[PDB]
Symmetry: D2
């Protein structure tokens, strides 16, 4: 079927790419980077993030596959020296499809219109100059007034990323939820924050509303653009999910174990 | 229908209790402390925990309701000066039923199963050294005070104090947090709290010591000659009686951030 | 004597400024070149500016902070006490409390640039990952990877340091505290995790790994330093002087900020 | 005028006799601890009144400790060299006043249910605590229980003490600081009960049950522990080799 492959940039990844495209020529595999059904990322998790946003409009018809040319990643689980068996399994169509939840980021302005974003790892909101002060509104109800560096809403699969370094909890990707973590909160008598990471289920909306400043630095999967005149930033579990092609069994907790503890 | 009421022990809880039994005599409510359908807890969260474990065998037919005589609790959501409206609403039978997930604690050596509403902790008796096994696979070797497996509703309890995350009770999962773990060259732990979904089993296995103190929601028992302590999301769920809308996040807000109208 | 006053920018600070400057019209001469008493009106951020404005003549200046807004750790005196301050600052009836400072030294591939910190000095990246080697007293300690590192002053512990999970140190202690900023604690970059408090004559040297362009921030100024070879941290011999009139305990000031 | 303390095992007892050949256990000037840090604490508490006249030396028969710095199979050179670094200590007073001396730290937890006290710093109320307990640590004891509780690691050349929280609920009624607190010399931290007055007071895990407690005072002790320095093992290296491998 219609597949494609993205490469990191180094010689090792570009070399492995051509050999797989060749391999896919021995079967009924058509190379198409416009309407693919299988997107293969070769490199790392950062490379995988690029391949995700490259096809965020066609997430429903694409099963992603990651290959790490360096160290083991949470999205790139396949070793380079396993690409032959990967090609054969991807030719017969002998694989199941596992789906991970995603984060929907909506930013509102002083109405130009509305900007929606999709996060695989997480979405963060910081300031653009001095202090970052917003009001956290959970389900149309005020929860706290934040003051610090920013806030980080993470995906279940993104919990092992920026979320963990910020003190967040590690959630299994089978759980459809989102986790909110604080970034250097001052937490005083005026700006009293919960401190603890917050895990929100489906259909729960976390609305960030400005206080004195409306210029924020919104980052989604490390794409960080400056949004001016912001009126509202909404977080919620997107109905859209990213699909993975499962062949073998690489448990999430083992992948966490092999990454943070020891391999 | 068949109801009952548990009391803390002080006069404030005991006085308010009788006043509800009286009010409920004006309706078709049969007072039964053996086989109730609606259990009312008066006191605090600790009192509510007692009401849960007192009738954990008949969770299937019981809708729990909590009343706090002191400060606002996460299970005791109803204020004393609202007890008048509760009997009226609970007599007509006009209420919805919200269910929260529970934690199943299994100990092996006679195998002992326990059910947790808040959380379950495992400590030593000197040093506490165990092996954390996730789904029949080794994850880490723990060394510290102990480990805490929490329920979503129990995240706002001991879990929060240990630096754990606050999880919404609509999520069927369980959270594992560390209790003062040492992180040196020999015992590298994950550090971060771990949230496990359903059908995921976290097994704690002893190393060079077999005497641990297992604690289950406001309890504490000494288990001797322990070979395995298994954790998993229980199939059993606790049922609450809903009349109005008191969001989970509001009870978190009113507890830790501020309560400006009180 | 030779004094001066800096203002935050809002109407409250400029109004309070003029009202105090008049008040002194005693043997008080307004001088912004060689002052002996610098009064900051606004907030802690305003006070930091007044510190860096006269970081060259720190031995002859006793600072006084007035907060027009919420209570600060440097601007501790309330506006409705500016009346008595003028009289007390006229007799010369005051004692002198000194707080430690942080010395930041940067080396290139050239010379070297030294900086003075009242709150703290942080070193982050300029784009992607921040990877450096933490060297304590010419000895390797760890290889860090995350957002950055924060070396704080005792008086600056109640600022960014606390938000990063750092410990609160009393300003009577001559030391410095190093805290981590979202460090990835994995198998390759194993960091200590816990904040590190270093005494006097102890040098913490941050040395680059693959990148040599860092965003070095001192207190309130954050500039981008290219071709960085070494960043050294140590407790500076220079100290900031305060004019103490009444008794406002440090822990009491911490209580009033975070607990009430 | 020296002496040697042993862990209890044969390996330590064997090494003990071999060093004795190379003695006063009433008026010693040089104390050698053979075993571990826990064993080292016993040798410390055994002579806390004459700490001013004793230079301590630790030898680990097991893993490397922060107090047991000397290797067992290199102890041969030690007798010749033994023929001065000072670390701060913690003073714990319980209210008739009962004084205690801590090398690592002194902790206070409950004895049944909740642990609720009022933290009073220099005769001034700071916060009302509610949780498992509180931990006041020495600079040298920061690498012990203090670190596990999320405390900061301070160098032993600093004369101070660090207070860390143990599972604080930290809510709107019991608002705690959260951050570890470092107090200098002549600073007194007074812990005062609310309802229950029976707590488990622990000094170097010498946990005794104190009934009818009215006040628990913490302050940097004037007495300091002395070590016999022969080589140079930096504190941060000792931290490095332990946690960073
Ligand atoms: C891995 C990595 C990485 C990549 C770039 C930059 C950094 C340090 C500065 N980080 C940022 O400015 C935000 S992104 C980030 N920070 C952190 C952080 N401190 N500890 C863990 N992981 C982080 N992420 C992950 O970086 C990823 C961006 N993609 N890449 N490479 C995001 O998706 C986050 O998951 C770390
Ligand atoms: C609140 C706030 C605030 C103020 C200015 C800027 C920001 C966003 C990012 N902050 C920084 O990059 C460092 S400055 C800073 N951030 C923080 C921080 N997130 N939480 C606490 N306190 C901070 N300081 C204190 O601000 C001082 C400088 N400006 N002021 N005031 C610095 O010394 C810090 O100690 C937040
Ligand atoms: C209530 C209570 C309570 C409060 C403070 C201290 C203690 C004794 C030290 N903690 C324990 O032994 C475990 S129970 C516990 N500790 C903690 C804790 N430190 N901070 C918050 N909440 C805790 N829980 C919660 O209390 C619940 C009620 N138990 N009681 N009493 C227990 O299920 C825990 O969820 C019990
Ligand atoms: C590993 C371990 C360990 C050691 C002792 C006890 C325990 C189980 C429950 N916790 C306690 O009993 C508290 S005593 C303690 N725990 C810890 C701790 N987790 N990590 C560092 N250090 C501690 N201290 C220190 O060790 C020394 C106690 N004796 N020993 N060994 C004392 O100085 C304490 O300050 C676990």
């Amino acid at each position: 079927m219609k597949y494609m492959i993205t490469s990191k940039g180094d010689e090792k990844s570009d070399l492995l790419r051509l050999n797989m495209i060749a391999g896919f020529g021995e079967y009924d595999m058509e190379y198409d980077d416009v309407e693919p059904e299988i997107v293969i990322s070769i490199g790392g998790d950062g490379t995988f993030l690029s391949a995700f946003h490259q096809y965020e409009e066609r997430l429903d018809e694409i099963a992603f596959i990651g290959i790490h040319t360096g160290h083991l990643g949470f999205y790139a689980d396949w070793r380079p020296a396993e690409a032959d068996k990967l090609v054969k399994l991807l030719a017969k169509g002998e694989y199941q499809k596992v789906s991970y939840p995603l984060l929907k980021t909506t930013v509102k302005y002083g109405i130009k219109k509305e900007a929606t974003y999709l996060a695989l790892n997480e979405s963060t909101v910081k300031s653009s100059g001095g202090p970052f002060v917003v009001d956290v509104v959970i389900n149309d109800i005020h929860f706290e007034r934040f003051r610090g560096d920013g806030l980080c809403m993470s995906t279940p699969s993104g919990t092992t990323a920026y979320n963990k370094s910020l003190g967040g909890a590690l959630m299994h990707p089978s759980i459809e939820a989102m986790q909110l973590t604080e970034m250097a909160s001052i937490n005083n008598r005026v700006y009293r924050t919960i401190g603890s990471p917050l895990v929100f289920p489906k259909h729960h909306v976390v609305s960030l509303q400005p206080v004195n400043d409306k210029d924020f630095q919104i980052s989604v999967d490390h794409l960080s653009i400056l949004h001016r005149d912001v009126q509202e930033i909404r977080y919620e579990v997107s109905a859209k999910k990213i699909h993975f092609a499962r062949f073998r069994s690489f448990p999430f907790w083992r992948r966490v174990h092999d990454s943070f503890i020891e391999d």
